[PDB]
């Protein structure tokens, strides 16, 4: 005999989206801080 198993794999990457969201967040916080002086 031989252990001729078969695999199928489903996987995803979020870390780029994570950083894109951080970039948008801090841009809106920039708007927040200038609106506070206005």
């Amino acid at each position: 005999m031989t252990e001729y198993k078969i695999k199928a794999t489903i996987e995803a990457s979020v870390a780029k989206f994570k950083r894109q969201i951080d970039s948008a967040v801090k841009s809106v916080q920039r708007f927040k801080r200038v609106a506070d002086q206005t």
């Binding site: 005999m1 031989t2 252990e3 001729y4 198993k5 078969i6 695999k7 199928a8 794999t9 489903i10 996987e11 995803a12 990457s13 979020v14």
Partner: protein, 57 residues
């Protein structure tokens, strides 16, 4: 003996654990192939992509 596991974060691996199952998926020196996981790959690919799209549309 078809099973799956969460083998990593955002990673699920399906596995046919029966030893001879490759010989059935691919055929042999004596047998025609009777592919059974490939036809499901063609299905679950579409569902996975369209559901991930629907998470962001």
């Amino acid at each position: 003996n078809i099973r799956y596991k969460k083998t990593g974060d955002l990673q699920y691996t399906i596995t046919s654990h029966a030893a001879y199952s490759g010989f059935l998926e691919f055929g042999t020196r004596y047998m025609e192939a009777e592919p059974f996981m490939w036809p499901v790959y063609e299905v679950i690919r579409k569902s996975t992509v369209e559901e991930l799209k629907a998470l962001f549309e």
